[PDB]
Symmetry: C3
Subunit: 119 residues, 3 copies
C-alpha cells in the first residue's frame, strides 16, 4: 500500500523526505503525460506502467494493497507470503525505491509547471 | 473506489489519460470552490455534489468504497449486487464518465492558477 | 480515516471548505519541507509529525484507519472504543481540527509556489 511504498523509499533514500518524490517532474506523484524530464522522472514513469499491469489482476488496487516485505539496512525484499496482487505490487515498489536511490535529484524539477513542461 | 472511477473514464474516454482530468479547472481533482470554468469543469462539480450526498449514508466513504459494475465497449452499468453506499457511489462515477465523454477538453484549463481563477 | 478528518474540520470550521486546507502553505495537503509560512501552516506541520508517530505502531496507516469519534456542535471527542492505531490517529485529527479553528486563514498562502517558498 501507499504507506509501505513510502517506507521503501525511506529504506533506500533515508536522506530524503517522501514528500520530495511526491511532486517531481511529470510522473512523480501526479503525471501520466509528457516525457520524463530526467532519470528520476523516468523511475516514476516506469513505476506508473508497472502499476498499470498489476491492475490487470482482478481486484488489484495498488495503493490499497498491503503486501509483505522487509527493509534490512538499505536492502529491500518482497516476501513469498503474498498473493498475485500483493506480489506484483511489492515488486513495482521495490524496484522504484532502488531506482530512486541511483537517480540524481534535481531541485528545479520539483513542483514544476505541468502544462508548460509536460505533453 | 478511486481505481474503478479511473477505469470508467477509460471506458468512455479511452483516448485520454486519467491524469488529464485530475487537475483540470476548479473542480476536477481538487476543487470545491469557484464557478465551473467550462463544461468538463461542471461535470466535476456535479460529481463532487454527488459524492457529498453519498456521504450522508453512514459509513459511506466514496473513494474507498468498492462497487460492482461493468464496462462493455463504451457502455457503463452499475450492478444490482451493491449495498446503498456502493450503489450510490457507482451511479455518481458512471454519470461522471458519461459527462466527461461529451464535454470538450480545453488544454488551457489544465493545471490552472486556482487563486487567480477560482472563487 | 481521510473522510473522518475532513468531517472534523467541518465540525470546527463549518464556514470553510475542506479544499481550502488541502493546498495551503508548505505543509497543508502536500508538504513535509520548508518552514511553516504561518500559524495554520504550522498546524499542518504538527499534524504531519503526529501522523509520523502514529505510524510507529505496526499496521497503522493514518489515512486508511477508521476510528470512532463524535462531533457535537463544534465539539470533538475521540471515543474509547478505538484500538491503539485508531486512538492515536483520532487524537491527531481532533487536535488538527481545533488548531485550524483558532488559526487565521491567509488567502495568499493558498496554492503557493512550493519551490520558491519552501526549503
Amino acid at each position: 500500500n501507499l504507506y509501505q511504498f513510502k517506507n521503501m523509499i525511506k529504506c533506500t533514500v533515508p536522506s530524503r523526505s517522501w514528500w520530495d518524490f511526491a511532486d517531481y517532474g511529470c510522473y512523480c506523484g501526479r503525471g501520466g503525460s509528457g516525457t520524463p524530464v530526467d532519470d528520476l522522472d523516468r523511475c516514476c514513469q516506469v513505476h506508473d506502467n508497472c502499476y498499470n499491469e498489476a491492475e490487470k489482476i482482478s481486484g488489484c488496487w495498488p495503493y490499497f494493497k498491503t503486501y509483505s516485505y522487509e527493509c534490512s539496512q538499505g536492502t529491500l525484499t518482497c516476501k513469498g507470503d503474498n498473493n498475485a496482487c500483493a506480489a506484483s505490487v511489492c515488486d513495482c515498489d521495490r524496484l522504484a525505491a532502488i531506482c530512486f536511490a541511483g537517480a540524481p535529484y534535481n531541485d528545479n524539477n520539483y513542483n514544476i509547471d505541468l502544462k508548460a513542461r509536460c505533453q
